Design a protein around this nucleic acid. Sequence first.
RNA 1: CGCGAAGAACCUUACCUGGUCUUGACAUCCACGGAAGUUUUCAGAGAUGAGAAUGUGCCUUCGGGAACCGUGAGACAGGUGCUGCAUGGCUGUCGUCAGCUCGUGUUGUGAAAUGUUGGGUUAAGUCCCGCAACGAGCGCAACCCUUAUCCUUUGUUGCCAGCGGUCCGGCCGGGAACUCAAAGGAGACUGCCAGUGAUAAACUGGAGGAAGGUGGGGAUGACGUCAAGUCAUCAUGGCCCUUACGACCAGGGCUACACACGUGCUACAAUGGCGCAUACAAAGAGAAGCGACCUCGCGAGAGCAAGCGGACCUCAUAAAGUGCGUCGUAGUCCGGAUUGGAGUCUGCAACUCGACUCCAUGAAGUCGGAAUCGCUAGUAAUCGUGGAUCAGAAUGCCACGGU
Lengths: 100, 156, 99, 127, 206, 84
Amino acid sequence: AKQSMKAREVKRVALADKYFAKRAELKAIISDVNASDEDRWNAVLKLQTLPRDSSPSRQRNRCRQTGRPHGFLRKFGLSRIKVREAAMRGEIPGLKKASW
Amino acid sequence: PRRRVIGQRKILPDPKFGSELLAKFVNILMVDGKKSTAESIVYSALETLAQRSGKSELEAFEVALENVRPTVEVKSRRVGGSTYQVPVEVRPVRRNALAMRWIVEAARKRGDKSMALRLANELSDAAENKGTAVKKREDVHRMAEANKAFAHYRWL
Amino acid sequence: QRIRIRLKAFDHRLIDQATAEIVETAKRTGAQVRGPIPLPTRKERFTVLISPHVNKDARDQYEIRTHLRLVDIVEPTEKTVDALMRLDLAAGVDVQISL
Amino acid sequence: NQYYGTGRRKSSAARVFIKPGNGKIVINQRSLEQYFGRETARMVVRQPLELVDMVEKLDLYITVKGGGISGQAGAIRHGITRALMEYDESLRSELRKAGFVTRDARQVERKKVGLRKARRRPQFSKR
Amino acid sequence: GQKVHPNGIRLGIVKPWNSTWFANTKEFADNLDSDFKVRQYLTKELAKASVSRIVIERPAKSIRVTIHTARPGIVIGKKGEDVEKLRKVVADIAGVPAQINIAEVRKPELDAKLVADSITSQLERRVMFRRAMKRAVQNAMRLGAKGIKVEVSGRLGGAEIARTEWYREGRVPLHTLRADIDYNTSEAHTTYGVIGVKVWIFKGEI
Amino acid sequence: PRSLKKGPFIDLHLLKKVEKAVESGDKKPLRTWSRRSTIFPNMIGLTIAVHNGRQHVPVFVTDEMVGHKLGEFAPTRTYRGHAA
RNA sequence: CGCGAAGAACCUUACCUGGUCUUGACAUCCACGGAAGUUUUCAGAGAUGAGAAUGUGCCUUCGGGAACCGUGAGACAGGUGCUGCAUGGCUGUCGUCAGCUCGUGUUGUGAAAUGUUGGGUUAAGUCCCGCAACGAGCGCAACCCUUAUCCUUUGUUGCCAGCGGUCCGGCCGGGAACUCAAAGGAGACUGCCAGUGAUAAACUGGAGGAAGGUGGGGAUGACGUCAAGUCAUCAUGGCCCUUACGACCAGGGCUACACACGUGCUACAAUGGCGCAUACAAAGAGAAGCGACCUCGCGAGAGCAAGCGGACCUCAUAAAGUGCGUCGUAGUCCGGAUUGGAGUCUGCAACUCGACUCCAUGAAGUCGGAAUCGCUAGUAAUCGUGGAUCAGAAUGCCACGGU
Ligand SMILES: [Mg+2]
Ligand SMILES: [Mg+2]
Ligand SMILES: [Mg+2]
Ligand SMILES: [Mg+2]
Ligand SMILES: [Mg+2]
Ligand SMILES: [Mg+2]
Ligand SMILES: [Mg+2]
Ligand SMILES: [Mg+2]
Ligand SMILES: [Mg+2]
Ligand SMILES: [Mg+2]
Ligand SMILES: [Mg+2]
Ligand SMILES: [Mg+2]
Ligand SMILES: [Mg+2]
Ligand SMILES: [Mg+2]
Ligand SMILES: [Mg+2]
Ligand SMILES: [Mg+2]
Ligand SMILES: [Mg+2]
Ligand SMILES: [Mg+2]
Ligand SMILES: [Mg+2]
Ligand SMILES: [Mg+2]
Ligand SMILES: [Mg+2]
């Protein structure tokens, strides 16, 4: 892909790592809980206050070997065609061409 | 079709009476992959005729079949560049096939209270030969008489 | 305390070699055993588009098959459990011993 | 003590047992008339009980799993047929000629890439 | 038309997977990346070591790397100093200790990687491609190849237009599944473009 | 719509600037890029220069518009017609 | 032309406006202080700039390093910038069509021919006969996968013929016979009979047989064609920028609408609609995930929370079906667009521009012109179910089963 795009993505996942366990989950739960009142409003302001790159939805998983945004697979972490060629060389265990 | 010739397909016979024709009739009546309801209506139609005509409904459907089974057809062809409706004698496996097909749509245009009821009336009115089936068969006969002029055209 | 051995491997030949090398080690320590049972092998099928730029009908199907075997030990011993730890097995099969 | 039969029409399995009896059949701890709603589905089970005279002398416990209504009925038919095979093995010239011992190997076809219904190809314009 | 990869089609039958390790979805892609890192780093600094095959094994608590090559002397060095440095770096790649087992190939010309890399290397050394492919084919047959096929394509001889050139001696039953075809592809970076080289070697069946 | 339990939406910079302007009286248009914020009655009777992509369109806050969003009154496309 | 895109609110994003940077977001090296992190505030749309506290790790020849952080300089990095008509790799196409060749011999002055043609036959250059050809190879076929039958092996997390117990439900001891799970093996070869045929090959019918003529499908795509597609997966020759075709941000656009085309989903209905009772599937997913039971909510959902890395736990019960009664041919108890009001859930945020629920409205449409497409058996047709992509976003795509 582009080195700029890959650098962008590494920064995004690092900030999400940094912030997912410290505020994000607890702010979500304290907005959902009906026991509290108006402390949820205060929480929403501080949630917006964060650098906003911390959302894991801000992340787009890409082929780490090539950075291609489209045609991604989660189990192999690669683009569609990159999985194919690596499979032909035999680098994915237990993988072959299906027939049924 | 073009290289290997093959024969007809065998169809499991009618379970309630042992016929092959009733099974084929209900199959061609079947629409959209629904044979469950098709079996129900065919049994209801035959029993209405059983109480109306003689007890043995087998013969009643048989006569309602024979008075509408066609022995001559109309086939569209082009040999020298002109439309030829050649009439040919049809072998009985196709005779009875085309007859029951026409009866199927004849009932649909009857437009009675229910599909079962209209089939019963159609099959009954064919027994007296006043049916729209006989109307269609007289219609094909007049055009068949008309096609005897084509009968000696190319590819007789 | 009857224990239950679970074995996962991509290759069917490898699981049979593994389940046939564990058992005689059980005989080496000298404990009666029960026969391994084939739990339903799981097949995963990934269908991937093969052309780099554009096609749709040209697509290949790749399946991963994971085979799963169960072993039940009826009367364990410290020597038997020491044998399970000490015995060496193929890198293609993982260990899921359960007390 | 109990003659065994197996039947499989499409994707179902049938477990069929024979004992002497008074012509009564139970299906999945349920009467056949209650279980098979369809009349054709009902009487396909008892079709081989006419050409074979043993209809009135056999109580028949059956358990059938999997498949659908017609498939389970066809599986039921094939299972009773085989269960009879280990009893008399002398009515073959009639039973085979009807076509009941034959296992219906016909099966639903796998979907194909570039096809919508595993044989239907998408409708296209020539232009 | 296009051909299936002869290694990939016969991977499940006669061709041992390069990676022969198991885990769950949790670390599948993670250890796949580690194998990529190991293989690319290994190849890049053993380009001269005539590396042919790399087999990565993942026992439950380590990684094992089997390097099938033709020059063990270069890849080990004196008293094994080089294999220990590769151990340090390769282990640090995956974050786990690493065993390195070096297997030797007595007949380099019957393995599809050595012949492919040699033919490619001759191109940037400016050896003419027709003679190069012929030299490879003659070597394989003399040293006991049952069948050989070589494919050199792309910008042959500095021409304007790329041409396809192939030459087959012996027997290459690709459509036969039990046939043992060792296939590899290598590339040549020349001042007039980039050249693909394909090699099929048949060495009997079953 | 954002769920009633979560309340309405408003931006921190917008909220802080609206209350300062309200406290200091409606004096000047409020420059904003936050189209996603929601019109809250605290800014009634004010002109908001909402961004559409190239030019900040003024909008006046009135009672009947409250609840609708700040970026709603800024059509980002200019399509006169397919005729001449 | 439901193509790359297995999924555009932000991101993706490569486009636009505007604010911005110029050894740079990304890599190697030079100099300086330094661990990262945590709390806090101010300007701003954020980038960024600014304020303030805590902190100083390891080996140590106390000489430095890595995670690195921040500024200056240079080799430069960086270009999803151009040329697929320079290329590699990969792919489409005829087409799974049956062809493409070689050795020796023979023929021809020779290029070459013959083999490979011809009579038949086959799915096939498949086989047979003839034939100056005899053989051989790549392709066809076979070996690989799945399904159809049986035998043997192991029996839990799957099964319950029999034994008893039966909280009367495979629930308990208990059984491994069976369904099933998966591992190996046997069988289907024109094998035998008859007829046709040219006593050949083949074709047709028959017997047995679970399966009979390649058993049904899948993978496998020869030599070559199209300067076919891709320089935007990637790599790469050449060309161009390198205070800008590079890079960081906030908003917008890729969703615009006088129209045309292609591919689909939902219908126009009575084989249907509507309501109740009632029965069975296969395949898969699931650890930042599937989420039971119970309670509240018409509802999508919310609360509490069991269990499940799974043949156990959860999405999970299927739908057309059947039995009942009404609808009674009516733009209708059809059809569902569209529109209003109120809501739920994701996410920082649903205005442009997400999906779903409840109430309110009920548009075209009563089967469609010339023309045109798919399909030969569980196949069309039709009915549901699952997966990847995925925070959320299917009528698309890939799979599964029912009639
Ligand atoms: Mg790049
Ligand atoms: Mg996303
Ligand atoms: Mg289907
Ligand atoms: Mg192919
Ligand atoms: Mg965008
Ligand atoms: Mg942007
Ligand atoms: Mg081209
Ligand atoms: Mg010759
Ligand atoms: Mg001569
Ligand atoms: Mg030829
Ligand atoms: Mg010739
Ligand atoms: Mg010739
Ligand atoms: Mg011939
Ligand atoms: Mg063929
Ligand atoms: Mg041949
Ligand atoms: Mg010949
Ligand atoms: Mg083949
Ligand atoms: Mg071109
Ligand atoms: Mg082009
Ligand atoms: Mg688009
Ligand atoms: Mg999704």
